[PDB]
Every structure is written in structure tokens, then in C-alpha cells.
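Q: What does the assembly look like in three dimensions?
Context provided by user:
Components: four
Sequences:
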Amino acid sequence: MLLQGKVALITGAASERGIGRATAEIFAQQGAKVIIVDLDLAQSQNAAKALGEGHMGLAANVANEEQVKAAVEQALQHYGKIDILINNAGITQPIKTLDIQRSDYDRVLDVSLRGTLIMSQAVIPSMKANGGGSIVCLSSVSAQRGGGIFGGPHYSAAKAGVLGLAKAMAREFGGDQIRVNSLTPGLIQTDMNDDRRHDILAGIPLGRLGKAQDVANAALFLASDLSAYLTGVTLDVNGGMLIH
Amino acid sequence: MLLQGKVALITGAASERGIGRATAEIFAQQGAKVIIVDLDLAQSQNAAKALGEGHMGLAANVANEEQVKAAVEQALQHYGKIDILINNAGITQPIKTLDIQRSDYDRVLDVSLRGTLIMSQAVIPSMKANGGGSIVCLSSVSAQRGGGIFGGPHYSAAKAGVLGLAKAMAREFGGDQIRVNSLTPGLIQRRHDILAGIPLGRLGKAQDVANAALFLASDLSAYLTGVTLDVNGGMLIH
Amino acid sequence: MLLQGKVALITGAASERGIGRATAEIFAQQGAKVIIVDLDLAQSQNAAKALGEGHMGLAANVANEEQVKAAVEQALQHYGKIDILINNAGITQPIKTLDIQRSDYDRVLDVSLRGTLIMSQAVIPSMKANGGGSIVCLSSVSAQRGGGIFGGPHYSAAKAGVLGLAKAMAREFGGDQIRVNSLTPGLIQTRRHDILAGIPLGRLGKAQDVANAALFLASDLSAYLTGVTLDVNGGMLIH
Amino acid sequence: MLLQGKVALITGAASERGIGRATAEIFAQQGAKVIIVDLDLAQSQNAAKALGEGHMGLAANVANEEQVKAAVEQALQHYGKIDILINNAGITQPIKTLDIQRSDYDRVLDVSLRGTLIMSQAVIPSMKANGGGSIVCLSSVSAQRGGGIFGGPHYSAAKAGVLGLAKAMAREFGGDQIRVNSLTPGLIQDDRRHDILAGIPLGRLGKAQDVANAALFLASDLSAYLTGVTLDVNGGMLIH
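A: Here is the predicted structure of the complete assembly.
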């Protein structure tokens, strides 16, 4: 029970087959109580109920400061603490550089980058008061190698911005024992019928796509005491797609 | 004459003491014609005239699509091409994580990240038609080491986002011979404490960054794309 | 347990205060049977018996092909398989660039780099035949930041060489499901005040911190990780 | 003239079509006097003579401490200084992990890693006495991505070791204004080549001149604030 007695908040975890839900499931299996925060309250509550007993579902647009703060307050009122924050919320968009409109940039940057800032801002005060915590930020191999997988350049930019933000927060809050680390998943199977799949898989030494559970297990590592001396780390979960 | 016959557009180069102006000066010394794009028209025109003859100054907020489009069109009308784009425009703010407000995030992200996207989007079509080009993006050591110098976490995020965008554009446009690379300057001219962690024992100069931009803009780097080039005096070795 | 039913060979784990022994202890706690390989037979046997029941201690210089072959053969004859290889053996020397002599270079490079190659060469065939495995290599933050901690430039070079070797083996054997990853520990408890000032988490590393990262890489929790360099440095190097 | 008045020592530059010779040519074009150090004295002297006037060829196995020291002494006696050291000497071998014998490891590590240490050790004292210098070490994309190009794992290891050594020397000698930086070339000029080429965004293999031009940047005052840098010259083959 790596997360026995811990409380974890995971954004974007209402969807059944997503990385967020897989992380919630594994966290609950490891003894944590999980707060799922996503756009739809009913979907978030149903996901939390599916995890088991003692979990919570809340609704928030991660780019809405006041809604995020209100949701975090409800979580803190019930659980009294948040030990772990998984900033998993994020959207991709398979368009190319010259097709990125202002509204596309805003949507993609808001969910990943602004949402990570806002949710981290909302949780950090209680983590300081509680003597520490672990924040895991979701980036992407696209931020490191310059896309070429699915998400367009604004997604690569947003997820690279997440890395810069995470490292800056790691440095600022190390003295408060708030560890901040990032995951850079490769090509992960979620919601492969195109011939382009062959080229990508040919570039993965392990010879398979990633699973949501693979990312969840790396998040478990960073959320747990097994990584107590890690902060500012970028942990690649890409099957060798990017070795560097 | 490393940039003989070339045309370079440099954003944020109107101020005399900035990296942008230092880059414009060195580029002009190396034979390039320079288009300075900055917020103030008169300041940009005066900076261009200070470089010498044949240069141009235009006014645009890099985060304003309409103003950027008008500036690039004026530049192309006069020069017929843009060989080099230096996305130097950027602002910083020394505020910590919990104090970053929506307007702070928007301002800092807009000048660096959105500005790099908008200006690159405006110039890339002509570069594709003209057989290639060199785009240099300005990041920061803060994007790599997690701040701790001056700019707050939203600056670190914006400059890290610039790296991600630059690499994505490098991959997309390699077949068009549009090279896209980034500079990660260290502390460029409390200072004593930072200076103690710099192996070369001095702060960076605007000319140091300009010379690295010159390398990336010139044919000396014809086989480099997607590169992040540290200009930090050893402050960050990794 | 995370390593239930697994067999792990750990080099350099005879000493009680080392990263190797801490890794052996945590691996045994997680259900693995551990083969300790180190220079002294009696010390390695005593360390293996201290872990519990069903473990093994063998003597070998990791830079000696014949001794490594003999040790791996004895381990395979008893356990029939090696699921996990922790290339923890390594030595350091606090000497500066101009003072590194041929014998200093040879000793430091042999234990870390040549030893990682020789031990990996000896274990890979059985891993390939058995359907995969996990190899963890021990590097150092010194390989990334250019020393400045304790080990001299030949130590930084040796541990950087380990990274290059590990990545090359990761790429070669990915299709065989042999994962190869590296740890880059910071300053571990195995002048301190000055270094401590540059560590955001405000403490030095513990052998258990490195062991726990090795546990992650050795376990199925990292089944999709190969070619990774995993920093265990408390924020000393953020990059 | 980016290297006007400078003296540069380049190892492994005797061969006509190599990166070393291309670097020597470009350095000479930029005003430097070049000392070519390679295994064969006759080949090195002929290469230096081909550069133009005022250059020098010397013989040394970079893994022989005393021969390297004697060669550097001859260079310093003639030129009085060495401003720039290009540790270009290196050999590769296309053999896979399980086929690397002790002798293969020794040969590959000796030319690249031990040779870089020995030649740097031999030149650094004069650079300290002269107020600084620039040392450029030759690594490879193989050290970063884990091979897969041509050189086997021991080549990837040797070239990664070079990076670790270079960064350590950069940190040690920054106060002496001895800059130490590394180049990581990609695939530099059939099925294997075609497959690799398909993963290069710029759509071509590198040329020796591409690497030489990056060495010129690092050797020149254009990079005066760079030390400890790893500069990729790979056409986008590895973006990271």
C-alpha cells in the first residue's frame, strides 16, 4: 500500500479509458483516497464511485480560477489535506503550425498550462501548511522532440511550458518539501487505423504503444515515498521512442 | 560577411540596450539588411536608421495578428524575402508562483510564446516559397533549470513553451529547409550571488547572445535544426 | 510484493553502508531472491545471508571476464534465471584533471564502465532466452553537471560512459524486452554544508533513495521505460 | 577572420576527407595557424603543407602520454602558444553489444576518451599560463540516443564519456578562461543509410564542413560565453 492514508487530487480523470482514470484506479488500489476533478460533475462523481468507497468527484474547468479554488476548498473541507496533486488535465489537437488559430492556442494552452498553474496555486497553500506534498505534472514526449506524433505544435508548446512551470515550482517550494515532477509519456493508447502507425511503432525500441496503466504507474512512483528525494525531474514514459 | 545579401527580421530590437538591438547591430555589420519590429514606430524607425543604410523599422505588438501581418507584408513588399527571423521579443516579471494573476500570465506568455507563434506563422509562408530560412527563438536558462534567476515561474513556462514550439516547427518544416533553433541565455546584462555560480566568472553580454544568434542565422549552422544552444557561461552544465 | 518471484543480481553490494546493500535489502523485502556479487567472497556470502533465506553471495571483479562468467554461471545453475541486473559496482577518486594517471583512469573506468559492459554481456543471453529483463546502471549527477561534487573528471567520464552504454544497449535489446535504464544519484550518504546549500530538498541523499529508484526500474511499474536516465539528486540538478 | 592570430591543434586531421582535415582547412581560411597531430608524421606534414604556409604536422598516438607531451612541446616551442585544441581523433567499430571484446573496447576508448584526456592534459598548462583557451571535444549523436547509426555500444560509451570529461574540465577550468565544449555530430558523409536518412528532417547527411563550421564557432570569440555546452550537429536526427 504505497499510498496508504494519502489523499490525491487528479484532474481530467472522469473519462473511462484515459490516463487520469487509470491513475485514479491504481492510486485507490494503493490505499489513497482520490478526488477526481473534471468538467462534468455527474461524470466525475460516477468515476469516483467506481473507484470504491471514500472517494470524491468534483466539477471544475481547470482554467477557471474561482471554480478550481471552490473545488479544492470542498476537497479540503472533507479530507482535511491533499497529499498528492496529479495535473493530468489536457487536450490535444492534430493540426499543423500554420493552421493554429488564436482559439486553438487558447484552448490547448488553457487546459494544460494555465490549468496546471491554477490547480497548483490552489493546492500549494495547504501543502505548505501540511508540511509537504507531491505534485505530478503531465507533459509529453512531443514537448521534448518537437511533436511528430499527434498533437500539433501548440500542444508541444503547452506541454513544454508545463515542464518549465513544474521545474520553477520545484525550485521555489523545495524548502517546503513540496516535490514537483513531470511525466513525459510517449504514444499512449487511449480513445492506429492509419498507415502512419507503422512509422511511429518502428521508432519504439520496446515495440509497442504505451498503456494508460504505464503512465499511472510512473505517477504512482512520483506520488509515493519511493521518490522522496526527487524534485524537478522529468520522467520519460515512452518505450524508448526518445532516448536522450 | 557571414550574412551578405540576407534580410533579417528581429522583434523587440528598438531599445538601445537590448539583445535585439545588439543582434541587429552585429547582423548589419555582417552584411544583412535588418527589419526591426517593436511596439513604437518612431523608436523602431530610429533604431533602423542607426544601423546604417537600407534597414527598416516597423511597429507591431507581436501578440497582435493584424499588426504582425501588416508589418511582415510591408517588409516583403520592400525586400521581397525574409531569410532570417529572430523572435527576440519577450518580457519578464519577478513574481513568485502564488502571486501570478491571469493578466500576468497572459502578458508574459503573449510576448514570448504567442508572439513567437504569430510572427513565425506570418513569415513561414514566404520562407517556404523562397526555399528555406533560419528562425531563431529566444528562450532562457530559466526554462531549463526552473527559474531562480529573475523571471518568475510564468516566465520559465513561457520560455520553455518557446522551446517546445521551436522544436515542433523545426520538425514540421525541415523538408522546406526552414531551420528553427533556440537560444537559452543565462543572466545577461543579488548579482554577486548569481555570479558565484558562473564558471566563466562574469555575466553575459547582449553581444554574446547576438553572436550565438549570428551563428544560427548564418550558413555556419546549415545542418542545425531543433537545437537548443545554451549561452550561460557554465551557469547550467547538463 | 513488487518483485515477487524475481531473481536479481546486484554488483558491489557486500558493504553494509553502500547503495548496493540498501538495494539488496529493499529488493529482498519486495520478494526477490538476490545474488550479491562483490570482490570478497566471505563478505558477499555474509551479506547474502543477512538478507534472509534463499539468497546467494559470489566473488568477482566486475572487470574480470573469467570471474564474471563463473559467477553468472553459478547464479544461473541455482536460480535458472536472472530477471534483474543492478550494475551498482563503481569506485570514485577525488583527483583533478591534471593529476589523473593511467592507473587512476584504468581503475575508475574498469569498475564502472567495463564492469557494466562485462556483467551485462554475461547476463543478457539468459535474459534474451527467458523473454526479457531489466538492467539498471549506476551513473552520477557528476556525469551530467561536470563533477564538482567529489569524483574527479575520470569519474564523471566513466559515469557518463555508463549512460552512453546503457542507452545503446536499451536500443539494441528493446525488441528482446530487455529494458536498460540508468540512475544518476546526487550526493548520497554512504564541504557538505556548501553542497547542501544547493539542494532544494535541504538534505543529502540516502542509500535507500537510490535503492527505491532502482526498485522502480527493476519492477513492472516501469515496464514501458527503457533508455531512461532517472535523476535522484534532491533538485541539486534541475534540467 | 574569426581566428586571426590564433594557433589551433587538431588531432586526427591527416586524412584528406575527414572532419579533422575539413576543420583544419576552415580554421586556416579563418586566419589560424594549425598543428595537425596524427599517427603518421609524413601524412600529417603533407596535410599541414596542403593547408598553406606556417602550419605544422606532428606525429602522436593520442593514447601515448609521453609522445603527446613531446609533440605539444614541439608545437609550443615553435608557436609559443596553443589557443585552440580540437580533440577530433576517434575511431568507430560497427559491432554489437555481445561481440565487443576487451581489445575492441580498449582501442575505441583509447582513441576517443583516453586521447581526449591525454591531449587536454598536455595543452591545459600552457592555456592556463596564456590566460585561457578553447577546447572542443568530438562526441556523437550515438552518445545521446544510444547508437543505432554505425558505431557499436562501446563507441556510444566512449563518446558519452567524452561529454562527461568535457563538462568536468569546463567546470574545473572556467576560472582560467579555458572553455571546454563538445560537438555531437549526426550521420556525416545503403539500406541502413537510407533508413537513417529518412529520419533526418533536413533530408540529407551531414558534411565534414558542417562539423568544421560548428568547431569554428566554438573555437572563436563568437562563443566566448559558452563552456560546458554540447552542440548537436545532426540535421534534426535527434531533437531533444
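Follow-up: Chain A has one domain: 1-244.
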